[PDB]
C-alpha cells in the first residue's frame, strides 16, 4: 500500500559520446566542445583590415613590381595575406638575399612609412630614367621596380658614386638595394662603361662588397641578365654609405618601421570578405564560444585551440536508457 522508489532521470536525447570501453553511448546531456565551421571569408581582425597582396609576393610589394602598384600607399594592417604561389614576384629575374628572414621580420610589423632616402632627381652624373625593361611593363611602357633605381652611364661615363643616408629618426629603417649581373661583357660596357666594377655598402655592422657576375643564362621573362637584391635594418642614428662604379641598383625609397606588434604573413587563396572577426584562419573566420576547433592550425587572433579531431563530445548527463 505505501511505497517509495529511488531512480534517475531519463529522456529523449540522441547525443552520443565515447569512452575507452564503449563507443556511441547515448547520454541524457552532453556538451560539444569542438567548433567545426567557419564563414569562408578573409576579414578585418578586430576593426583593422589585412594587407591583401592579391597576386603580388612580398618582394613584389617592397621593391615595387610595376604590376603591384596597388600597394604604393598602405595603411596600418593587422596581418598580411599572400597567395601560396603569387604570379607577380620579380618582373626582372634574379634573387632576393635572405628573403625568408625578411618575411620573418615582417611578421612582427604592422606599419611602414616610406621615406625617400635618395630621390631619383638627385642623380647629376648618371642617367636615372633609362634603366627600364620590357620584363617590367608599366601601363604599356617598359619600366622597372619603382622603389629602387637602375642607374646607367651618362655621356659614355659612369663616375664613382658615393652616397650616404643617416637615419636621423627614432625608428628602424628597412633599406633595399641591388646589383645587376649582366649577360656579357658587351652589355656591361654598353650600360656602365667600366669593365671592372663593384658595389660597397657599409653600416655600423654591414660590411659588403659585391661584384657583378657576367655569364650566359636561360631567358626568364625574356631576360638573360639577373638582378640580385639585398637589405638591411638601419638603426636609429646609424648611417649607410654606398659606393659604386657600375651595376648599382640604388635605393630611392626605404621603409621606416613605425608600428610593431602581433601580426602574421598568412598563406591563403581567399579574397577580402568585407566583414569583421576576432579570429581568422586561412580558410575563413571563426566565431564561436567553443574551446576547440579543427579548421586550420595557422590562425591569428583570440581563437579556440586547434585539434585534429573530427568529433569531441563531453558527457555531462548520465547514460540514457
Amino acid at each position: 500500500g505505501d511505497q517509495i522508489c529511488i531512480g534517475y532521470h531519463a529522456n529523449n536525447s540522441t547525443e552520443q559520446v565515447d569512452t575507452i570501453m564503449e563507443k556511441n553511448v547515448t547520454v541524457t546531456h552532453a556538451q560539444d566542445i569542438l567548433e567545426k565551421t567557419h564563414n569562408g571569408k578573409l576579414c578585418d581582425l578586430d576593426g583593422v583590415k589585412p594587407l591583401i597582396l592579391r597576386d603580388c609576393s612580398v618582394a613584389g610589394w617592397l621593391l615595387g613590381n610595376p604590376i603591384c602598384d596597388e600597394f604604393i600607399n598602405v595603411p596600418e594592417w593587422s596581418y598580411i595575406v599572400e597567395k601560396a604561389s603569387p604570379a607577380n614576384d620579380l618582373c626582372y629575374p634574379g634573387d632576393f638575399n635572405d628573403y625568408e628572414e625578411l618575411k620573418h621580420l615582417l611578421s612582427r610589423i604592422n606599419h611602414f612609412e616610406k621615406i625617400q632616402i635618395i630621390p631619383k632627381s638627385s642623380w647629376s652624373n648618371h642617367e636615372a630614367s633609362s634603366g627600364v625593361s620590357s620584363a617590367c611593363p608599366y601601363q604599356g611602357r617598359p619600366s622597372f621596380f619603382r622603389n629602387v633605381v637602375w642607374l646607367i652611364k651618362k655621356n659614355s661615363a659612369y663616375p664613382t658614386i658615393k652616397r650616404s643616408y643617416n637615419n636621423t629618426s627614432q625608428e628602424d629603417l628597412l633599406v633595399l638595394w641591388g646589383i645587376h649581373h649582366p649577360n656579357d661583357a658587351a652589355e656591361q660596357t654598353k650600360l656602365y662603361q667600366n669593365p671592372t666594377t663593384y658595389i660597397s655598402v657599409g653600416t655600423s655592422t654591414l660590411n659588403q662588397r659585391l661584384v657583378p657576375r657576367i655569364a650566359t643564362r636561360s631567358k626568364v621573362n625574356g631576360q638573360s641578365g639577373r638582378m640580385e637584391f639585398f637589405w638591411t635594418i638601419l638603426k636609429p642614428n646609424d648611417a649607410i654609405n654606398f659606393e659604386s662604379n657600375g651595376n648599382f641598383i640604388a635605393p630611392e625609397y626605404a621603409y621606416k618601421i613605425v608600428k610593431k606588434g602581433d601580426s602574421a604573413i598568412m598563406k591563403s587563396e581567399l579574397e577580402y570578405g568585407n566583414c569583421n572577426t576576432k579570429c581568422q584562419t586561412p580558410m575563413g573566420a571563426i566565431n564561436s564560444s567553443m574551446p576547440f576547433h579543427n579548421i586550420h592550425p595557422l590562425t591569428i587572433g583570440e581563437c579556440p585551440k586547434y585539434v585534429k579531431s573530427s568529433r569531441l563530445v563531453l558527457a555531462t548527463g548520465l547514460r540514457n536508457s
Binding site: 517509495i4 522508489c5 531512480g7 532521470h9 531519463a10 569512452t19 620573418h104 585539434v307 548520465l318
Partner: protein, 166 residues
C-alpha cells in the same frame, strides 16, 4: 555500470522526472507522483561543471603553430620544422581526445555512484521498518503520507516511530 545502480538493480530511468537528475517516485494514500532530490542533484551539477571547466583550463597552454618559410636549399630544416609542428599538434590532439575519453567514463560511473549512495542512505534510514523490493524500491510495513515523505527525502526519518508495526 561500475556501481551496479544505473541499468543494474535499478533497471531503468524515469522519462517522467523533468525535476532533476536523481529522484523519488512515491505511491501512497494521498496520490502518487515524482520528486527529484535537489540536494544531491545540485552537488552533482557542481562536480560536472568544475570537471568541464578544469578540462578546458588544462588545454590553455597547448601548442600554437607559427608559420615559417624556407628556401629550396633549406629542405632539411623545412622538414624538421614541419615534423615538429605536426608533432606537437598530434601530441595535444591525443591529450584532448584521451582526456575526454577518460573523464566521460568517469562521469558516467559518477552518476552511477550518486544514485547508489542515495539508495543506500535511504535504505539504512529504514532498516527493517520497510521491505526492499529489490528493483530499487521500498515498501513500508506501516502507514506513510506526504509529510512522511519530506522526512525521508531530507535525511531524517524516525526509526522507533514505526518500529513496533510488524
Amino acid at each position: 555500470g561500475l556501481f551496479g545502480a544505473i541499468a543494474g538493480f535499478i533497471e531503468g530511468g524515469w522519462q517522467g522526472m523533468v525535476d532533476g537528475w536523481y529522484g523519488y517516485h512515491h505511491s501512497n494514500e494521498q496520490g502518487s507522483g515524482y520528486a527529484a532530490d535537489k540536494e544531491s542533484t545540485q552537488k552533482a551539477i557542481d562536480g560536472v561543471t568544475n570537471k568541464v571547466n578544469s578540462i578546458i583550463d588544462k588545454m590553455n597552454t597547448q601548442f600554437e603553430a607559427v608559420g615559417r618559410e624556407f628556401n629550396n636549399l633549406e629542405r632539411r630544416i623545412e622538414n624538421l620544422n614541419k615534423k615538429m609542428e605536426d608533432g606537437f599538434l598530434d601530441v595535444w590532439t591525443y591529450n584532448a581526445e584521451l582526456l575526454v575519453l577518460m573523464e566521460n567514463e568517469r562521469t558516467l560511473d559518477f552518476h552511477d555512484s550518486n544514485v547508489k549512495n542515495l539508495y543506500d542512505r535511504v535504505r539504512l534510514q529504514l532498516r527493517d521498518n520497510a521491505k526492499e523490493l529489490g528493483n530499487g524500491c521500498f515498501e513500508f510495513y506501516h502507514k506513510c503520507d506526504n509529510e512522511c515523505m519530506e522526512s525521508v527525502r531530507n535525511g531524517t526519518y524516525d526509526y522507533p516511530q514505526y518500529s513496533e508495526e510488524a
